[PDB]
Amino acid sequence: DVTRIERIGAHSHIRGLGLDDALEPRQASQGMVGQLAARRAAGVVLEMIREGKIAGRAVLIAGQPGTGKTAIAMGMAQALGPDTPFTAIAGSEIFSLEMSKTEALTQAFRRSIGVRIKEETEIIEGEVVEIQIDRPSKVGKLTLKTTEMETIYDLGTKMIESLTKDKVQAGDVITIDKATGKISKLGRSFTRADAMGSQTKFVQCPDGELQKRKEVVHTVSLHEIDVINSRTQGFLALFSGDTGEIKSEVREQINAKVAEWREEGKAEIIPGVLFIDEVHMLDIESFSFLNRALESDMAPVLIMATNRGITRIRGTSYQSPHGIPIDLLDRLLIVSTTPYSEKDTKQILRIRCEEEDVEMSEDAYTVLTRIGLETSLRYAIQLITAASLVCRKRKGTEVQVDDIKRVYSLFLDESRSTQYMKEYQDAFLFN
Amino acid sequence: SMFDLIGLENKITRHEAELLSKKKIPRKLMEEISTSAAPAARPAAAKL
C-alpha cells in the first residue's frame, strides 16, 4: 500500500542463493532458478567468505549478457546477510577526480573488511537533584538520583567547570564518564514530561545502579578508521566523501593497531566481499593493483562480473579473454553461466510476475517466453509490467496474449529498433 | 531536522540513543505527571 524507498527492482526477487546445506542448488528456490553449476560455485565461494580464513581470493563471474551474473552476486549478498561487509561497486566508480584509481580500489578493499571493537566505559547516570554554592578553588556537591538510589558527589574544579559549562540544572538526566569526567545531558526530568518545549528532550529517571559497567561493540570498516585518522575532523569525510588519498603510513599504523586489538581480544575482524560489476571497465593499472592488493592479509574476497568476449584491455592495445590481463586471470577462479532454456526463461518470468504482483495467462506466458528467447530476457521482464499497465487500462484482471502483443508493438527491442533505424539510417545523425 | 544525521554526530552516542529510546517518557506517565501535584517531600539534610 505504502511506497518505501526500496521497490520492485531488477533483482528484488532474489532472496538468496537457493542451495541445500550440501550446496546443491534447488531448481527454483529463494527466487533464483537455473544456473545450477554457477549457483553451486557461488555457494562454495560463500562458504569461503563465511569461514573468513583465506585472504584475497578472487572469483570472476563470466557469461553472456542476461545470464544471471548480477543475479548470482545479489543472491550471494542476500545469503551473506548484513553485518558481513558486501561492498558493491561498478568498475566506473573508481575513476574519480578525488583520488587515484589505486586509492579508490584501496578504499573499496578497506570497506569490505569489518571491525567489531568492544570497550568498557563505566559511566554514572542519574537525575541531578542539587548543585550547591561553589563560591569559596571552587568546591560543590552534586546529588544524583536513580529510581533505587541517590548519592552525593564532591566536585573538583574540572567537574565544576564542566557542570557550569553545560548549565546542568536540577531535574535533568546526565551520564558521567568516570575515565574522562565527561558530562552528557540526555534529557530533562520526569516531573514535567510541564509548560515547556524546545530543542529539549524528556527522559524518565534511570533505574538501578548509578554506576554501571557497560560493554559496547562498535562496528566499523578499515576505511572508516582510515578516514577518521586521516585528519582531525576526518569523520566528516564519511559523509561528504572528501577523503583525498589517505596516507599509506596511516593505513600501516591502523593495520598494526587492529592486529594488536585482535590479539588483545578487543577487536574482531569480519572479512567481507567486494563486488565489482563490469570489471572490464578497469584499466590495466587497476588490474595491476588488484594483483597485489589481493596478496595482503587484510584483503577481502573479490567477486567480479564481466560479459566481455575476447576484448582489448582498457588503456592498452592487448586482446585478453575477459578484458582482464592474463596475470590477474590466473589469480582468480572463473564461474561461467550457461544460457537459459525455455523452461528456465519461463520460470524466471513467472518469478518476476510474482514480484510485480501481475497475473498472466498461460498463453501469455508461452508468448512472452518465446519473445524473450527471440529478443532477450530483460525485454520480457519489462514487457511484464508494460502489459500489466495495458491490462489495467483495459479494466482486466489477467494479462492476455493480446496485451503482450500490444506492448510488443508499442515497445521495440534492440533488433527491431536497429532494423527500423537501418532502413531510415540517413535520417539519423552520424550513420 | 529529523533528516539531519550529520548534526547528531556532535551530540550523542549510539548507546546514549538506545538509552534514550528505552527511557523516553511514556505517554500515559506524561498525563499522570501533568495531573499530579508537586511531590516536594525532601527529607532535608540530617548528617547522621
Binding site: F202, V203, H218, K257 | E16, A17, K24, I25
Partner: peptide, 28 residues
C-alpha cells in the same frame, strides 16, 4: 500529544557513528 510526538522523534534518532566510536577509532 504534540510534546510526546516531537520528543518521540528527538529521542528515537541514532547517530550514524557517534562520539564514542570516533574516539575509540583514533590512533594515539
Amino acid at each position: 500529544d504534540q510534546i510526546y510526538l516531537v520528543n518521540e522523534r528527538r529521542c528515537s534518532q541514532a547517530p550514524v557513528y557517534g562520539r564514542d566510536l570516533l574516539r575509540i577509532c583514533a590512533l594515539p
